[PDB]
Amino acid sequence: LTACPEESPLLVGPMLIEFNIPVDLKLVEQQNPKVKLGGRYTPMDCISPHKVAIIIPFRNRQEHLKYWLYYLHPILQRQQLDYGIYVINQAGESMFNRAKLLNVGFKEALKDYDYNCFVFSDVDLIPMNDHNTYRCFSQPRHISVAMDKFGFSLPYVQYFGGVSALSKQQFLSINGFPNNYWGWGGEDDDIYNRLAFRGMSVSRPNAVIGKTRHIRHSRDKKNEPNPQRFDRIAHTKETMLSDGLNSLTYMVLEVQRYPLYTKITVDIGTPS
Numbered sequence: 488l489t490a491c492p493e494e495s496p497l498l499v500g501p502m503l504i505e506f507n508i509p510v511d512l513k514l515v516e517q518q519n520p521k522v523k524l525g526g527r528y529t530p531m532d533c534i535s536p537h538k539v540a541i542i543i544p545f546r547n548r549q550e551h552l553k554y555w556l557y558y559l560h561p562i563l564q565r566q567q568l569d570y571g572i573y574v575i576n577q578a579g580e581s582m583f584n585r586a587k588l589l590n591v592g593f594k595e596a597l598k599d600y601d602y603n604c605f606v607f608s609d610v611d612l613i614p615m616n617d618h619n620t621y622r623c624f625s626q627p628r629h630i631s632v633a634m635d636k637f638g639f640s641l642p643y644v645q646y647f648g649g650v651s652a653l654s655k656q657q658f659l660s661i662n663g664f665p666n667n668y669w670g671w672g673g674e675d676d677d678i679y680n681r682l683a684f685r686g687m688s689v690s691r692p693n694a695v696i697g698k699t700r701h702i703r704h705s706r707d708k709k710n711e712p713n714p715q716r717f718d719r720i721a722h723t724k725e726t727m728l729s730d731g732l733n734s735l736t737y738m739v740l741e742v743q744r745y746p747l748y749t750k751i752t753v754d755i756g757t758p759s
């Protein structure tokens with residue numbers, strides 16, 4: 488074989504993305520016969536330099552996930568990526584912790600395969616153009632840059648929520664993500680602070696190819712706005728070495744290897 492071309496000959500460009508169509512995981516599996524157990528795929532005729540673990544924070548979002556899988560699997564294959572899908576399921580009924588779930592996905596995926604790239608994607612984001620490559624770059628990559636719920640633009644230049652990608656070294660560089668953000672908000676801003684403090688710039692595709700759709704939804708119970716988030720963002724420079732990968736504690740309760748993804752149910756503790 489040889490290295491995969493910088494531009495895949497499979498890309499179609501702009502895509503029609505909607506969430507009313509009846510989707511079936513059996514059908515999705517049937518439509519993607521090259522997707523191996525656990526949501527793993529590898530280009531047959533070229534060597535992908537990108538070994539990407541796609542981490543999805545999850546609790547009670549099976550319907551959103553079904554649409555995510557339905558759209559992403561064809562897209563990711565056309566992008567000629569050596570990838571695997573990881574759905575990190577938070578057990579219990581405590582406050583939701585998006586960032587801690589992402590940390591779990593990082594460590595757990597590394598236990599399966601020597602990934603060198605990590606895409607962190609919300610379960611409800613779908614790219615509208617397959618040129619928006621779900622891989623890592625020389626700088627930390629922000630992927631969901633032109634979401635429809637933000638009028639197809641950035642709400643602010645520091646916005647790092649939604650979908651993003653850090654290489655293994657980039658991720659380790661900032662001691663990963665915080666674990667102390669319980670509830671909604673601020674954890675993405677905190678992560679942006681970490682990248683800045685370690686001297687990294689954010690890489691983004693243009694607003695045209697970075698158009699993504701957000702599945703409109705109501706707030707999940709136990710994901711209410713965190714009142715402490717403002718203070719924590721203020722002190723990111725102090726806490727990023729005391730809160731992250733080096734302080735991550737969790738308990739894997741269950742692992743399930745579905746055809747289209749690996750589901751890891753974890754106990755990540757409670758707020759304090």
Ligand SMILES: NCCCCCCOP(=O)(O)OP(=O)(O)OC[C@H]1O[C@@H](n2ccc(=O)[nH]c2=O)[C@H](O)[C@@H]1O
Binds near residue numbers: 547
């Ligand atoms: N009612 C209208 C406004 C709703 C505002 C509530 C927050 O919505 P968002 O800002 O999009 O964030 P979010 O989608 O709730 O949470 C982020 C991501 O974490 C995941 N997530 C969050 C909460 C939850 O109970 N389960 C879950 O899986 C999911 O991947 C989600 O995509």
Ligand SMILES: CC(=O)N[C@@H]1[C@@H](O)[C@H](O)[C@@H](COS(=O)(=O)O)O[C@H]1O
Binds near residue numbers: 642648672674716720
């Ligand atoms: C401190 C804080 O709350 N930062 C939040 C971010 O976590 C969030 O990513 C962004 C998008 O919000 S959204 O339009 O409601 O999705 O809004 C900011 O205010």
Ligand SMILES: [Mn+2]
Binds near residue numbers: 609611701704
């Ligand atoms: Mn959402």
